[PDB]
Amino acid sequence: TKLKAPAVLAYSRKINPTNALMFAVNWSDRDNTTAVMVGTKTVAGTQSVRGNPNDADKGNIQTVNFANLPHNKNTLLVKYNVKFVGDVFKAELGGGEYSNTLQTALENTDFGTLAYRYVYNIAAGRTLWRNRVGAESIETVITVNDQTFTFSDLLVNEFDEDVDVAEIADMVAGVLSGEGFVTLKVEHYMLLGEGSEVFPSQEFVENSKLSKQLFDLNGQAAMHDQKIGNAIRTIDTWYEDATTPIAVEPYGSVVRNGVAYRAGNKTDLFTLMDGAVNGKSLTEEDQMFVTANLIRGGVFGG
Template identity: 30%
Template sequence: MATKKKSGSGSGSAKVVAAMRGINVSDAPMCSIVGKELLPLEVMRHGIRGTQNLTPGKFDPNKLANIQITETAKTHPQATGMHLRFALQVTPLSRLLTACDSAEVRADIEQFLARAANSEELMELCRRYARRVFSGSFLWRNLTLAHSLDIHARCAGQTAQALGERPFELAERGFSEYTEDEMKLARWLQSSFASQAGLGQGIEVSAKVHFSNAGAFEVYPSQMYVSGKPQGFARPLYKLNPVSPSDLNRARGDKDVHSFMDSINMGQAAIRDQKVGNAIRTIDTWYAPGNVPPIAIEPNGASLSDNEFHRRPESGNSFFNLLPGIRQLTQDLKPEGSGMQTSPDAMFVLAVFIRGGVFGDAGKSGND
């Protein structure tokens, strides 16, 4: 899978290359579906008395109970499903590159992106992004609750959709046999990437997760990482319009039996933008030969799910290995609609630029 630098096809070197994020998404607020109403789904902070599940080295045989403060989110008791929505905005390829300390490398990248705007490689990326949207990947663990799904994408008064059991079927297809609705969304994305002025058209995505039975089911907003959290605190969840620290302290410190709160509404549950975006860009199946599961687009093929770098620099197929050969990758791009076989390396490099980030010569990168 590695691309070796060909004679006469190599670009110069740059210590720093930076690109804007090409797919910009909003947070996805979560609501309970109750009849025809959408009711904000609340994150509740409360106490639990569980049991130990520690490894032998940390197991305390004299301490059975595990008492913690935690946060959970549950649907309304009469909810028949859950609803969420997010907005998606595309940055044109011509505006992605924001910094490069080599004029030669900058020119080569700009030429690559200009040619990619009307390439079959970009169209395939957009088809894959559309597949990830219409398969409901952005719902993550919440898919386990779904009896059926209704997913809609809307752009400039038009609608594309995947309803009922279709999203589950699309998830099983991998990246092939694209539907007419997926092609419609892919064309909206491609048109915005190829635009030469401003931002592309905005796209709104909404999803309804239908339950088999009504009930107060636990759902899964994003989980927040907190360093140095106090002992006895289990997990914080992502929420919108969170309760102020002063109000929280008052509620926690209240000793009056008439006003004491055993659980506190912390705000509206949501899946955060980074997690939604990560789901959409989980399209890299070119990192290894054969039928492999897709991983998120990352310069070194980092995958948190299996704690592995799948595109290590020594393998020759990391972004940092491929970037010096960008002139050859530019030549490898196929015209859109040509029906010619696409270049996996060119698609990967293009997808990394769309991911965005600051890429240093030491192989370090971060999302922009």
């Protein structure tokens, strides 16, 4: 007993998405993909900072980025490849006095549901935060091992039953429970309207710097890989007072709301893995949450 957790214990990320490159298409002209360019407009304004009152007279020529659709294409296309990898129970930096006990404590994990919610967050449009808002038509095409799947009307908040997501979830759960990998090429086509302004992900700017950096690969608007990884693991409906699916965190913590849902109420990942290697009976939902964290990965040492 009293199997104390290793200080070096970490797990690798098992859902690896690429950067979500963003293109402009039409709804019936889906093959002509023109890359959405981040424009950048200059704004003239004096600097106002707390530490330098002497520098407020002149300076701060700032040039803020923006990204709209072109005025001939009404559909935004978002392309990214989500790579699910198996052996989520292998610790990369941990070892096997604790990670092997985790293997033999989370073998009864229903990966079917875990994978369903992953592919449902892929398909329903959780990966399209501010640009699925106000779109009159949502479409998702998933290409997986030469199989094409079409999704039109999936409400993203609840994980309802559709056999299309389920079909992919099968091979995704077979990867995650076993050994190997699977790759889902996900292209989202959302009809926002003619010249509607799109929403790339944001680089962190300083309190000063410029107003807003949109995410650029080679000049073209895109969204962060870790931001999509936040979308995919947004499956946590099993904490106490669970209203909406949150991103599976080791503490159940969302930064933008200023509260942590699983911290400080004995449902955090660390107490559940210590309970697993000390062998108390877990329910299915918290064990699924622990396996979702191990799929997410991260260093758990102290």
